[PDB]
Ligand binder design. Structure first.
Ligand code: 0N8
Ligand code: MN
Ligand code: MN
Length: 178
């Protein structure tokens, strides 16, 4: 599983995931499903940012804390958009809203509710993906076109397939908590 992540995710994603884990005092070499999840979520974040036109999204996920809030506060100032309680993952310049992107090994509707309840926002859009084709976005507005979405859902499927080929999937599938 450690080998699978090192192999299937690019080196910048793997370094970010390491740093995030070590900041909570966890060891990527032992909490390898968490490691994998983090990498997976980051890749989805970047993929999604690339689904727009050229300048459509601002990436927030993947940045250190000071920079991430610098971006967020700067947007809130230059747009009147209200200030989220938690860092989001993206800002959408076209829809003028922050996005929270979830990637779940469970079911999309449950993770959506959990995410909605943790956020406190009538205003941050939430978009959840699974490894088996499901999405659930706020007010059924999936933001990107179906082809962008499909490239994301397919990549997640491919990840799941690759894990299962290495017998990592059962364990990975069962590692996410409420
Ligand atoms: O869950 C997501 O889909 C997500 O994008 C989470 C986040 O960005 C974090 C902020 C957050 C975002 C949304 C919600 Cl509901 C709760 C917290 C900040 C960095 N995160 C860094 C981190 C990841 C894993 C282990 C330690 C730290 C944790 C929560
Ligand atoms: Mn985030
Ligand atoms: Mn997210």
């Amino acid at each position: 599983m450690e080998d699978f992540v090192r192999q299937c995710f690019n080196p910048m994603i793997v370094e970010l995931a390491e740093k995030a884990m070590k900041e909570y005092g966890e060891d990527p070499k032992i909490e390898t499903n968490k490691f994998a999840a983090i990498c997976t979520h980051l890749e989805v974040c970047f993929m999604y940012s690339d689904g727009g036109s050229k300048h459509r999204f601002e990436i927030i996920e993947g940045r250190d804390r000071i920079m991430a809030w610098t971006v967020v506060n700067s947007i809130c100032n230059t747009t009147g958009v209200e200030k989220p309680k938690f860092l989001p993952d993206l800002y959408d310049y076209k829809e003028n809203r922050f996005i929270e992107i979830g990637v779940t090994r469970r079911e999309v509707h449950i993770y959506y509710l959990e995410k909605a309840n943790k956020i406190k926002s009538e205003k941050t859009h939430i978009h959840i993906f699974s490894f088996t084709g499901e999405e659930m976005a706020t007010k059924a507005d999936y933001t990107l076109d179906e082809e962008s979405r499909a490239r994301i859902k397919t990549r997640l499927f491919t990840i799941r397939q690759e894990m299962a080929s290495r017998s990592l999937w059962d364990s990975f599938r069962q590692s996410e908590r409420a």
